[PDB]
Structure 1
Amino acid sequence: MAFLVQVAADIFNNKVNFELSFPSRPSISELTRSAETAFSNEISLRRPDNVPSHKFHSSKIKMYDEELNKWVDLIREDQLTDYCQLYVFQPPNEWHKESQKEIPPAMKPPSSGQR
């Protein structure tokens, strides 16, 4: 009925995983905008009061390809499959660093940002 993608990232030293819903297979631009919005909302929610406000910026997106059993770059508009798992990197920054903490079961993304 809807096309789902799981999108994971490292936010303040926790691995987060969101289920994003689309009417059909999204474009990479559409997916990227949806993911940046969801992760920016997560940052706003989780931000420690000693950290300045900031947004999530995607730098590279990988997809775990079950056909090849490996992580590959998301480059083409015919790679995404329903309920596939993506991981989104950011450019180097002070607050969010990569970890090999396992990707948790996907949850609905935040419902809003912070007023």
Structure 2
Amino acid sequence: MAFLVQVAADIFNNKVNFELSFPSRPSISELTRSAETAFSNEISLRRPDNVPSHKFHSSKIKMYDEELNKWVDLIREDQLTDYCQLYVFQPPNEWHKESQKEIPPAMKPP
């Protein structure tokens, strides 16, 4: 009865995996406030409260469809196509060392 979408990110500092469900309100401003907050929610938990939690925004976004089993570009207001899975890209700041994991609930850095 419910329609669902998934959102994730790639930064050598924060690597996140989240699950989101739509009842009867499919808008695009819905994806950018959810994903940009996923990364900022990782920074705000590490440092205490009352102090700034940096400024984080999305750079390049791609949409994967498991029906044709291939990567396609992000469409707006019609973003829920056959559930649809999302991955967000951002380049390194320091830590140039290689890493690999990915599991259904979201992961925290060591």
Query: Shared fold (TM-score greater than 0.5)?
Result: yes
Q: Give the TM-score category using the shorter length.
A: 0.5 to 0.7
Per the normalisation by structure 1, the TM-score is 0.61
Identity %: 100
Gaps in structure 2 of 5+ consecutive residues? none
Q: Which deviations, in whole Å up to 9, do the C-alpha atoms of 1:58-78 show, x marking residues without a partner?
A: 122211112331122213332
Q: How does 1:1-115 map to 2 (within 5 A)?
A: 1-13=1-13, 15-24=15-24, 26-46=26-46, 53-81=53-81, 83-90=83-90, 93=93, 101-102=101-102, 104-105=104-105
The CA distance in 1 between the partners of 2:26 and 2:109, in whole Å, is: 17
Is the CA contact (8 Å cut-off) linking 2:40 and 2:53 kept in structure 1?
no
Deviation (angstroms), 1:49: 13
Deviation (angstroms), 1:39: 2.3
Gaps in structure 1 of 5+ consecutive residues? 111-115
Deviates more, 1:48-57 or 1:28-37: 48-57
Is the CA contact (8 Å cut-off) linking 2:64 and 2:84 kept in structure 1?
yes
Deviates more, 1:10-19 or 1:98-107: 98-107
